[PDB]
PDB file of C-alpha atoms and ligand atoms in Angstrom:
ATOM      1  CA  UNK O   5     -24.970-150.322 -16.090  1.00 56.78           C
ATOM      2  CA  UNK O   6     -24.564-150.528 -20.141  1.00 55.11           C
ATOM      3  CA  UNK O   7     -26.070-147.933 -22.760  1.00 56.93           C
ATOM      4  CA  UNK O   8     -29.439-149.345 -23.261  1.00 56.59           C
ATOM      5  CA  UNK O   9     -32.754-148.166 -23.291  1.00 58.12           C
ATOM      6  CA  UNK O  10     -32.661-149.939 -19.259  1.00 55.61           C
ATOM      7  CA  UNK O  11     -29.526-149.394 -18.365  1.00 56.36           C
ATOM      8  CA  UNK O  12     -27.993-146.004 -20.511  1.00 53.99           C
ATOM      9  CA  UNK O  13     -27.027-143.197 -19.303  1.00 49.18           C
ATOM     10  CA  UNK O  14     -30.277-142.011 -18.182  1.00 49.00           C
ATOM     11  CA  UNK O  15     -30.002-144.124 -15.267  1.00 47.28           C
ATOM     12  CA  UNK O  16     -26.179-143.944 -13.949  1.00 46.24           C
ATOM     13  CA  UNK O  17     -27.493-141.681 -11.357  1.00 48.46           C
ATOM     14  CA  UNK O  18     -29.326-144.420  -9.493  1.00 51.20           C
ATOM     15  CA  UNK O  19     -26.408-146.378  -8.745  1.00 52.06           C
ATOM     16  CA  UNK O  20     -23.944-143.687  -8.933  1.00 56.07           C
ATOM     17  CA  UNK O  21     -25.301-140.192  -7.556  1.00 58.36           C
ATOM     18  CA  UNK O  22     -21.882-138.074  -8.827  1.00 57.37           C
ATOM     19  CA  UNK O  23     -23.614-138.532 -12.179  1.00 57.00           C
ATOM     20  CA  UNK O  24     -25.341-135.411 -11.575  1.00 56.22           C
ATOM     21  CA  UNK O  25     -22.084-133.794  -9.819  1.00 55.71           C
ATOM     22  CA  UNK O  26     -20.343-130.164 -10.413  1.00 56.28           C
ATOM     23  CA  UNK O  27     -17.961-131.328 -13.175  1.00 56.92           C
ATOM     24  CA  UNK O  28     -19.303-134.340 -15.268  1.00 58.36           C
ATOM     25  CA  UNK O  29     -18.141-135.117 -18.678  1.00 61.88           C
ATOM     26  CA  UNK O  30     -17.921-134.849 -21.900  1.00 61.24           C
ATOM     27  CA  UNK O  31     -19.682-130.931 -22.261  1.00 56.92           C
ATOM     28  CA  UNK O  32     -20.074-129.610 -25.589  1.00 55.37           C
ATOM     29  CA  UNK O  33     -17.429-127.278 -26.446  1.00 54.86           C
ATOM     30  CA  UNK O  34     -18.418-123.471 -27.510  1.00 59.00           C
ATOM     31  CA  UNK O  35     -15.425-122.287 -29.378  1.00 57.81           C
ATOM     32  CA  UNK O  36     -16.535-118.457 -29.053  1.00 57.61           C
ATOM     33  CA  UNK O  37     -17.065-119.351 -25.320  1.00 56.79           C
ATOM     34  CA  UNK O  38     -13.574-120.842 -24.563  1.00 55.31           C
ATOM     35  CA  UNK O  39     -11.223-118.621 -23.120  1.00 54.79           C
ATOM     36  CA  UNK O  40      -7.826-117.986 -24.824  1.00 55.76           C
ATOM     37  CA  UNK O  41      -5.368-118.505 -22.154  1.00 53.98           C
ATOM     38  CA  UNK O  42      -2.099-117.322 -22.932  1.00 50.32           C
ATOM     39  CA  UNK O  43      -0.523-118.587 -19.781  1.00 48.52           C
ATOM     40  CA  UNK O  44      -0.816-122.337 -21.063  1.00 51.62           C
ATOM     41  CA  UNK O  45       2.473-124.171 -22.124  1.00 52.33           C
ATOM     42  CA  UNK O  46       2.528-126.604 -24.833  1.00 49.30           C
ATOM     43  CA  UNK O  47       1.613-130.373 -24.440  1.00 46.84           C
ATOM     44  CA  UNK O  48       4.354-132.651 -24.089  1.00 46.11           C
ATOM     45  CA  UNK O  49       3.598-135.924 -24.838  1.00 46.25           C
ATOM     46  CA  UNK O  50       6.716-138.365 -24.721  1.00 49.04           C
ATOM     47  CA  UNK O  51       5.073-141.921 -26.023  1.00 51.69           C
ATOM     48  CA  UNK O  52       8.648-143.159 -27.753  1.00 53.02           C
ATOM     49  CA  UNK O  53       9.481-145.514 -25.042  1.00 56.29           C
ATOM     50  CA  UNK O  54       5.778-146.872 -24.869  1.00 56.07           C
ATOM     51  CA  UNK O  55       5.194-150.615 -24.464  1.00 54.85           C
ATOM     52  CA  UNK O  56       2.048-152.031 -24.894  1.00 55.91           C
ATOM     53  CA  UNK O  57       0.999-155.489 -23.778  1.00 56.88           C
ATOM     54  CA  UNK O  58      -2.589-156.464 -24.671  1.00 55.24           C
ATOM     55  CA  UNK O  59      -6.033-155.820 -26.058  1.00 55.90           C
ATOM     56  CA  UNK O  60      -9.133-157.024 -24.155  1.00 55.74           C
ATOM     57  CA  UNK O  61     -13.082-156.732 -24.408  1.00 58.38           C
ATOM     58  CA  UNK O  62     -14.498-155.357 -21.464  1.00 56.94           C
ATOM     59  CA  UNK O  63     -18.148-155.198 -22.184  1.00 57.26           C
ATOM     60  CA  UNK O  64     -18.208-152.018 -23.207  1.00 55.24           C
ATOM     61  CA  UNK O  65     -15.116-151.211 -25.003  1.00 55.75           C
ATOM     62  CA  UNK O  66     -11.436-152.682 -25.973  1.00 56.00           C
ATOM     63  CA  UNK O  67      -8.883-151.257 -24.226  1.00 58.02           C
ATOM     64  CA  UNK O  68      -5.178-151.415 -25.486  1.00 58.82           C
ATOM     65  CA  UNK O  69      -2.900-151.753 -21.901  1.00 59.85           C
ATOM     66  CA  UNK O  70      -0.003-150.159 -21.712  1.00 58.11           C
ATOM     67  CA  UNK O  71       2.947-150.980 -19.312  1.00 59.11           C
ATOM     68  CA  UNK O  72       2.921-148.116 -16.378  1.00 58.84           C
ATOM     69  CA  UNK O  73       5.541-149.443 -13.901  1.00 61.39           C
ATOM     70  CA  UNK O  74       8.247-147.105 -14.852  1.00 55.54           C
ATOM     71  CA  UNK O  75       7.873-143.602 -16.832  1.00 58.31           C
ATOM     72  CA  UNK O  76       7.455-144.658 -20.517  1.00 59.74           C
ATOM     73  CA  UNK O  77       4.985-143.122 -22.081  1.00 60.09           C
ATOM     74  CA  UNK O  78       4.468-139.511 -20.176  1.00 60.23           C
ATOM     75  CA  UNK O  79       2.066-136.502 -20.665  1.00 64.47           C
ATOM     76  CA  UNK O  80       3.152-133.085 -18.888  1.00 64.16           C
ATOM     77  CA  UNK O  81       3.170-130.030 -19.503  1.00 64.93           C
ATOM     78  CA  UNK O  82       0.050-128.109 -21.075  1.00 67.20           C
ATOM     79  CA  UNK O  83      -2.568-127.272 -17.956  1.00 65.46           C
ATOM     80  CA  UNK O  84      -0.890-130.073 -16.099  1.00 69.17           C
ATOM     81  CA  UNK O  85       1.434-129.865 -12.880  1.00 71.67           C
ATOM     82  CA  UNK O  86       3.591-133.284 -13.051  1.00 71.41           C
ATOM     83  CA  UNK O  87       3.743-136.337 -14.735  1.00 71.43           C
ATOM     84  CA  UNK O  88       1.048-138.536 -15.858  1.00 68.46           C
ATOM     85  CA  UNK O  89       1.880-142.176 -17.139  1.00 66.59           C
ATOM     86  CA  UNK O  90      -0.440-143.228 -19.952  1.00 68.77           C
ATOM     87  CA  UNK O  91      -1.935-147.015 -18.604  1.00 67.17           C
ATOM     88  CA  UNK O  92      -4.545-147.307 -21.529  1.00 67.35           C
ATOM     89  CA  UNK O  93      -6.604-146.091 -24.131  1.00 63.04           C
ATOM     90  CA  UNK O  94      -9.935-147.017 -25.783  1.00 62.66           C
ATOM     91  CA  UNK O  95     -12.503-145.336 -27.922  1.00 57.71           C
ATOM     92  CA  UNK O  96     -16.346-144.423 -28.209  1.00 59.62           C
ATOM     93  CA  UNK O  97     -17.835-145.146 -31.591  1.00 60.53           C
ATOM     94  CA  UNK O  98     -21.668-144.819 -32.715  1.00 62.05           C
ATOM     95  CA  UNK O  99     -23.894-146.856 -34.947  1.00 63.33           C
ATOM     96  CA  UNK O 100     -23.132-144.183 -37.962  1.00 62.05           C
ATOM     97  CA  UNK O 101     -20.611-141.739 -39.106  1.00 61.92           C
ATOM     98  CA  UNK O 102     -23.120-138.578 -37.560  1.00 61.39           C
ATOM     99  CA  UNK O 103     -22.528-140.041 -33.657  1.00 60.88           C
ATOM    100  CA  UNK O 104     -19.784-141.130 -31.865  1.00 61.42           C
ATOM    101  CA  UNK O 105     -17.693-138.534 -29.885  1.00 60.32           C
ATOM    102  CA  UNK O 106     -18.168-137.831 -26.661  1.00 56.75           C
ATOM    103  CA  UNK O 107     -16.963-134.059 -26.769  1.00 57.71           C
ATOM    104  CA  UNK O 108     -19.077-131.588 -29.057  1.00 57.99           C
ATOM    105  CA  UNK O 109     -17.350-128.453 -30.578  1.00 59.27           C
ATOM    106  CA  UNK O 110     -20.254-126.007 -31.352  1.00 59.37           C
ATOM    107  CA  UNK O 111     -22.737-128.992 -31.002  1.00 59.12           C
ATOM    108  CA  UNK O 112     -21.151-130.964 -33.911  1.00 57.23           C
ATOM    109  CA  UNK O 113     -20.769-134.657 -33.140  1.00 54.61           C
ATOM    110  CA  UNK O 114     -17.839-137.212 -34.573  1.00 54.33           C
ATOM    111  CA  UNK O 115     -17.827-140.718 -35.835  1.00 53.77           C
ATOM    112  CA  UNK O 116     -15.725-141.992 -32.564  1.00 53.54           C
ATOM    113  CA  UNK O 117     -13.333-140.120 -29.611  1.00 53.50           C
ATOM    114  CA  UNK O 118      -9.961-141.483 -28.690  1.00 51.37           C
ATOM    115  CA  UNK O 119      -9.403-140.979 -24.989  1.00 51.56           C
ATOM    116  CA  UNK O 120      -5.840-141.539 -23.417  1.00 49.60           C
ATOM    117  CA  UNK O 121      -5.872-142.128 -19.793  1.00 48.45           C
ATOM    118  CA  UNK O 122      -2.870-141.030 -17.872  1.00 50.78           C
ATOM    119  CA  UNK O 123      -2.614-141.013 -14.078  1.00 52.43           C
ATOM    120  CA  UNK O 124      -0.086-138.558 -11.765  1.00 54.74           C
ATOM    121  CA  UNK O 125       2.567-140.497 -10.720  1.00 53.60           C
ATOM    122  CA  UNK O 126       2.671-137.994  -7.359  1.00 54.60           C
ATOM    123  CA  UNK O 127      -0.097-140.536  -6.189  1.00 54.57           C
ATOM    124  CA  UNK O 128       2.008-143.480  -6.900  1.00 52.73           C
ATOM    125  CA  UNK O 129      -0.796-145.919  -8.343  1.00 50.29           C
ATOM    126  CA  UNK O 130      -3.607-145.511 -10.490  1.00 49.16           C
ATOM    127  CA  UNK O 131      -5.930-146.711  -7.417  1.00 51.44           C
ATOM    128  CA  UNK O 132      -5.063-143.503  -5.639  1.00 51.61           C
ATOM    129  CA  UNK O 133      -4.899-141.336  -8.414  1.00 53.08           C
ATOM    130  CA  UNK O 134      -8.690-141.595  -8.378  1.00 57.56           C
ATOM    131  CA  UNK O 135      -9.114-140.575  -5.131  1.00 55.41           C
ATOM    132  CA  UNK O 136      -7.686-136.797  -6.114  1.00 56.62           C
ATOM    133  CA  UNK O 137      -8.980-133.779  -7.897  1.00 53.92           C
ATOM    134  CA  UNK O 138      -5.736-134.155 -10.263  1.00 58.87           C
ATOM    135  CA  UNK O 139      -5.639-137.458 -10.077  1.00 58.15           C
ATOM    136  CA  UNK O 140      -5.954-138.209 -13.826  1.00 59.19           C
ATOM    137  CA  UNK O 141      -5.490-136.501 -17.277  1.00 57.11           C
ATOM    138  CA  UNK O 142      -6.946-137.640 -20.600  1.00 56.18           C
ATOM    139  CA  UNK O 143      -6.265-136.813 -23.985  1.00 56.76           C
ATOM    140  CA  UNK O 144      -9.135-136.773 -26.068  1.00 58.47           C
ATOM    141  CA  UNK O 145      -9.029-136.928 -30.299  1.00 55.58           C
ATOM    142  CA  UNK O 146     -11.427-137.044 -32.529  1.00 55.30           C
ATOM    143  CA  UNK O 147     -11.869-139.240 -35.462  1.00 53.30           C
ATOM    144  CA  UNK O 148     -13.557-138.520 -38.797  1.00 55.32           C
ATOM    145  CA  UNK O 149     -14.609-140.473 -41.666  1.00 56.55           C
ATOM    146  CA  UNK O 150     -12.422-140.300 -44.675  1.00 57.54           C
ATOM    147  CA  UNK O 151      -9.123-141.533 -45.051  1.00 56.77           C
ATOM    148  CA  UNK O 152      -7.722-144.532 -43.748  1.00 55.84           C
ATOM    149  CA  UNK O 153      -5.154-144.378 -40.831  1.00 54.28           C
ATOM    150  CA  UNK O 154      -2.131-146.385 -41.173  1.00 50.70           C
ATOM    151  CA  UNK O 155      -1.485-146.605 -37.635  1.00 51.33           C
ATOM    152  CA  UNK O 156      -4.421-147.623 -36.808  1.00 55.97           C
ATOM    153  CA  UNK O 157      -4.681-151.048 -38.680  1.00 56.56           C
ATOM    154  CA  UNK O 158      -2.735-153.097 -36.095  1.00 58.85           C
ATOM    155  CA  UNK O 159      -5.749-152.773 -33.836  1.00 61.99           C
ATOM    156  CA  UNK O 160      -8.487-152.980 -36.640  1.00 62.27           C
ATOM    157  CA  UNK O 161      -6.921-156.584 -37.551  1.00 62.88           C
ATOM    158  CA  UNK O 162      -6.924-157.884 -34.195  1.00 64.26           C
ATOM    159  CA  UNK O 163     -10.619-157.135 -32.813  1.00 65.81           C
ATOM    160  CA  UNK O 164     -11.831-160.136 -34.991  1.00 66.96           C
ATOM    161  CA  UNK O 165      -9.889-161.618 -31.862  1.00 68.93           C
ATOM    162  CA  UNK O 166     -11.647-160.276 -29.277  1.00 68.65           C
ATOM    163  CA  UNK O 167     -15.097-160.081 -30.529  1.00 71.45           C
ATOM    164  CA  UNK O 168     -16.568-161.093 -26.730  1.00 69.01           C
ATOM    165  CA  UNK O 169     -16.906-159.370 -23.594  1.00 71.74           C
ATOM    166  CA  UNK O 170     -13.863-161.073 -21.327  1.00 72.29           C
ATOM    167  CA  UNK O 171     -11.684-162.059 -23.959  1.00 74.22           C
ATOM    168  CA  UNK O 172      -8.068-160.369 -24.191  1.00 75.74           C
ATOM    169  CA  UNK O 173      -5.336-161.088 -26.945  1.00 73.18           C
ATOM    170  CA  UNK O 174      -1.543-160.059 -26.589  1.00 73.93           C
ATOM    171  CA  UNK O 175      -0.747-156.872 -28.386  1.00 73.17           C
ATOM    172  CA  UNK O 176       3.168-155.732 -28.011  1.00 72.61           C
ATOM    173  CA  UNK O 177       5.352-153.281 -29.940  1.00 71.64           C
ATOM    174  CA  UNK O 178       2.315-150.955 -30.559  1.00 72.95           C
ATOM    175  CA  UNK O 179       2.961-147.245 -30.939  1.00 73.02           C
ATOM    176  CA  UNK O 180       0.367-144.935 -29.657  1.00 74.80           C
ATOM    177  CA  UNK O 181       2.545-141.781 -31.879  1.00 77.16           C
ATOM    178  CA  UNK O 182       0.432-143.574 -34.629  1.00 75.44           C
ATOM    179  CA  UNK O 183      -3.399-142.411 -33.508  1.00 74.58           C
ATOM    180  CA  UNK O 184      -1.698-138.324 -32.914  1.00 75.28           C
ATOM    181  CA  UNK O 185      -2.994-135.379 -35.186  1.00 75.25           C
ATOM    182  CA  UNK O 186      -0.172-133.214 -36.826  1.00 74.66           C
ATOM    183  CA  UNK O 187      -0.967-130.277 -34.100  1.00 73.20           C
ATOM    184  CA  UNK O 188      -1.174-130.156 -30.582  1.00 70.70           C
ATOM    185  CA  UNK O 189      -3.602-127.399 -30.186  1.00 69.93           C
ATOM    186  CA  UNK O 190      -6.062-128.009 -27.308  1.00 68.34           C
ATOM    187  CA  UNK O 191      -9.120-127.167 -24.859  1.00 65.02           C
ATOM    188  CA  UNK O 192      -8.667-128.211 -21.336  1.00 66.57           C
ATOM    189  CA  UNK O 193     -11.495-127.909 -18.808  1.00 65.28           C
ATOM    190  CA  UNK O 194     -11.865-130.218 -15.482  1.00 65.91           C
ATOM    191  CA  UNK O 195     -13.812-132.960 -16.116  1.00 67.33           C
ATOM    192  CA  UNK O 196     -14.580-136.257 -14.855  1.00 67.88           C
ATOM    193  CA  UNK O 197     -14.741-140.049 -16.090  1.00 65.84           C
ATOM    194  CA  UNK O 198     -17.433-140.629 -18.746  1.00 64.97           C
ATOM    195  CA  UNK O 199     -18.503-143.883 -17.544  1.00 67.22           C
ATOM    196  CA  UNK O 200     -19.140-145.386 -13.880  1.00 68.50           C
ATOM    197  CA  UNK O 201     -17.661-144.469 -11.311  1.00 65.78           C
ATOM    198  CA  UNK O 202     -17.446-141.264 -13.354  1.00 66.59           C
ATOM    199  CA  UNK O 203     -15.220-139.871 -10.825  1.00 68.41           C
ATOM    200  CA  UNK O 204     -14.515-136.001 -10.948  1.00 67.94           C
ATOM    201  CA  UNK O 205     -10.550-136.788 -10.921  1.00 65.91           C
ATOM    202  CA  UNK O 206     -10.122-135.582 -14.715  1.00 65.90           C
ATOM    203  CA  UNK O 207      -7.941-132.754 -16.174  1.00 67.37           C
ATOM    204  CA  UNK O 208      -9.548-133.241 -19.562  1.00 62.99           C
ATOM    205  CA  UNK O 209      -7.220-131.790 -22.713  1.00 66.10           C
ATOM    206  CA  UNK O 210      -9.235-132.312 -25.976  1.00 67.36           C
ATOM    207  CA  UNK O 211      -7.309-131.878 -29.278  1.00 68.91           C
ATOM    208  CA  UNK O 212      -8.695-129.141 -31.726  1.00 64.25           C
ATOM    209  CA  UNK O 213      -7.787-131.242 -34.463  1.00 64.71           C
ATOM    210  CA  UNK O 214      -9.347-134.052 -35.733  1.00 66.48           C
ATOM    211  CA  UNK O 215      -7.422-137.839 -37.288  1.00 66.02           C
ATOM    212  CA  UNK O 216      -9.148-139.497 -39.995  1.00 65.15           C
ATOM    213  CA  UNK O 217     -10.050-142.898 -40.508  1.00 63.68           C
ATOM    214  CA  UNK O 218     -11.691-145.275 -43.341  1.00 66.25           C
ATOM    215  CA  UNK O 219     -15.218-146.229 -42.946  1.00 66.95           C
ATOM    216  CA  UNK O 220     -13.836-150.150 -43.487  1.00 65.93           C
ATOM    217  CA  UNK O 221     -11.915-148.860 -40.056  1.00 63.12           C
ATOM    218  CA  UNK O 222     -14.886-147.844 -38.115  1.00 62.26           C
ATOM    219  CA  UNK O 223     -16.801-150.507 -39.356  1.00 62.84           C
ATOM    220  CA  UNK O 224     -14.543-153.313 -37.929  1.00 62.09           C
ATOM    221  CA  UNK O 225     -15.574-151.500 -34.143  1.00 61.07           C
ATOM    222  CA  UNK O 226     -19.110-151.943 -34.934  1.00 67.54           C
ATOM    223  CA  UNK O 227     -18.928-155.475 -35.287  1.00 71.67           C
ATOM    224  CA  UNK O 228     -17.946-155.693 -31.330  1.00 70.96           C
ATOM    225  CA  UNK O 229     -20.163-157.468 -28.769  1.00 72.38           C
ATOM    226  CA  UNK O 230     -20.836-155.909 -25.666  1.00 71.42           C
ATOM    227  CA  UNK O 231     -22.568-159.601 -24.575  1.00 74.20           C
ATOM    228  CA  UNK O 232     -19.780-162.576 -23.705  1.00 75.31           C
ATOM    229  CA  UNK O 233     -19.152-165.203 -25.592  1.00 75.61           C
ATOM    230  CA  UNK O 234     -22.344-167.597 -26.215  1.00 74.96           C
ATOM    231  CA  UNK O 235     -25.046-165.210 -25.241  1.00 77.77           C
ATOM    232  CA  UNK O 236     -27.559-162.886 -27.546  1.00 78.71           C
ATOM    233  CA  UNK O 237     -25.536-161.206 -29.537  1.00 74.97           C
ATOM    234  CA  UNK O 238     -25.538-157.214 -28.895  1.00 73.39           C
ATOM    235  CA  UNK O 239     -23.401-155.157 -31.133  1.00 73.41           C
ATOM    236  CA  UNK O 240     -20.959-152.870 -29.153  1.00 73.31           C
ATOM    237  CA  UNK O 241     -22.295-149.219 -30.639  1.00 71.56           C
ATOM    238  CA  UNK O 242     -22.931-146.158 -29.183  1.00 74.19           C
ATOM    239  CA  UNK O 243     -21.065-146.681 -26.310  1.00 73.58           C
ATOM    240  CA  UNK O 244     -21.016-142.964 -25.476  1.00 73.37           C
ATOM    241  CA  UNK O 245     -22.470-140.701 -22.913  1.00 71.69           C
ATOM    242  CA  UNK O 246     -24.324-137.230 -24.020  1.00 69.40           C
ATOM    243  CA  UNK O 247     -22.720-133.921 -23.137  1.00 68.65           C
ATOM    244  CA  UNK O 248     -23.347-132.511 -19.388  1.00 66.41           C
ATOM    245  CA  UNK O 249     -24.005-129.345 -18.034  1.00 66.50           C
ATOM    246  CA  UNK O 250     -21.145-127.066 -17.589  1.00 66.59           C
ATOM    247  CA  UNK O 251     -22.102-125.246 -14.620  1.00 64.51           C
ATOM    248  CA  UNK O 252     -19.902-122.706 -14.367  1.00 61.50           C
ATOM    249  CA  UNK O 253     -16.826-124.259 -15.060  1.00 62.31           C
ATOM    250  CA  UNK O 254     -14.517-122.212 -17.964  1.00 59.61           C
ATOM    251  CA  UNK O 255     -12.999-124.097 -20.920  1.00 62.74           C
ATOM    252  CA  UNK O 256      -9.791-122.703 -21.882  1.00 64.51           C
ATOM    253  CA  UNK O 257      -7.937-122.861 -25.508  1.00 65.09           C
ATOM    254  CA  UNK O 258      -4.132-122.900 -25.824  1.00 64.37           C
ATOM    255  CA  UNK O 259      -4.937-121.294 -29.066  1.00 65.54           C
TER     256      UNK O 259
HETATM  257 HG1   HG H   1     -11.293-137.562  -7.987  1.00 67.21          HG
HETATM  258 ZN1   ZN H   2     -13.511-142.798 -22.723  1.00 67.27          ZN
END
């Protein structure tokens, strides 16, 4: 499975038939169709005491992993019931600045999309969480190209180190709070992972307001490799999945 002409999103249904399920992600967020729900509580993000551990190129993206043995960095409130622990974050980028985001707003596509993955701790482990309709919580943030984001440089600088598939590097004392927008206004809907195994275990929380990163910042992402070290070089670009059918589902607005 990949993002190529032969193993891309259009072919995932063969190995993963849930690809054609009832609550697949991402979707298109119609701002006029979304429902302002007044019963929506504010998001509660506690990442003050977060412990970053490493960064790894898994062949489809780079993940920054966090120590989730304890309630260090948790997400609660909003549409959620209980606490979700951050386990990792990754991005989806395009080849150009006019594509990249997974989720669209009125069909508008961003240069990248940041996903912070959280798992419901009543289930005890990530493994068990991905077996529940309410197992995971994904915090989605759109990235636009403009001004440089000071808080993202640490990552940008380490990518030289995990060029190919399989490489990993120590990556401690990274504060995720640096990746957040000013506003916590969001959209929420029941969805899935946007990569195989496309499990329908996620409560998606997409923030209204984007963070801006510089062109030189996003450019470093495009220098990455899908391929493993010592194989034909395949640039890690367009590692996103097209929007899917909402199919009955309703998208709620916190604003
Ligand atoms: Hg599930
Ligand atoms: Zn993702």
